[PDB]
Please model this.
Amino acid sequence: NKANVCWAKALVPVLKTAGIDMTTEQWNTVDYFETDKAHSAEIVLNQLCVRFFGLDLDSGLFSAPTVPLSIRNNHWDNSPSPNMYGLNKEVVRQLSRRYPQLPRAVATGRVYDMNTGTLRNYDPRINLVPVNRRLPHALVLHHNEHPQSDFSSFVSKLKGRTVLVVGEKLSVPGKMVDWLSDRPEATFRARLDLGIPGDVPKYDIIFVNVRTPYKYHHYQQCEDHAIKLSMLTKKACLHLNPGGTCVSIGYGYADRASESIIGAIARQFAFSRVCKPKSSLEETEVLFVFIGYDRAAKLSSTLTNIYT
Model:
């Protein structure tokens, strides 16, 4: 759906409107570029917008109708469509009152360092959080290295007979488990960057056992995970028996894409909860728990309590 190939090529003319010309070395700081995976050009544009200018796309910085970002035949491209992006000079003028060197940054493809108000060359560690965004929940400021969590016990306690585990292998005592992964021993072997295959069956429980590494900040970890929520967790709703359950590893919804994705998933289930079991030691990691698919019968406040 939102992940398609050639997203980096499609972004070249968009980024050029802000003076940005990415080298291979700079593209390699986008994880899916280095590993050659399908991605959303919009999520990547948002990531680069924060890295370069300290503002996310909701600032309007790229809202001019200059270059299309379109999805055609599983590719991102610049074919005509209403979904157009480009440096918006009127927005730059408005922001320059608060950020006086920002017009120079967007003319020359330099980083505007939000900590100093001065220009820098590209480094992904300079601007870690979009200063324009009202975060829906508190973020972890002090992350530590911990052993990986083991969610076998959690899934075993869920109600349901059939389980689809997506991502890394997970045994679930007492249930019948199918495993979707790009590993050779998977039940269904597929590239996970292309999402849950449409021909996968329906299940009582889907557990998205997929993690994203912490590199610079909770915000980075969340935005890097958003595409996985879009291609895996969001597609789980097509693969659930009536009243079924989806559980997914996540990191909250620090970024705009994750917030939209999680909200859309939650509206399809009777109950939505965030849980942090005892085996989950990494400070940013949570489980999103969606109970009662296609049935009727605080998320942000729970995340704030977990992450404060």
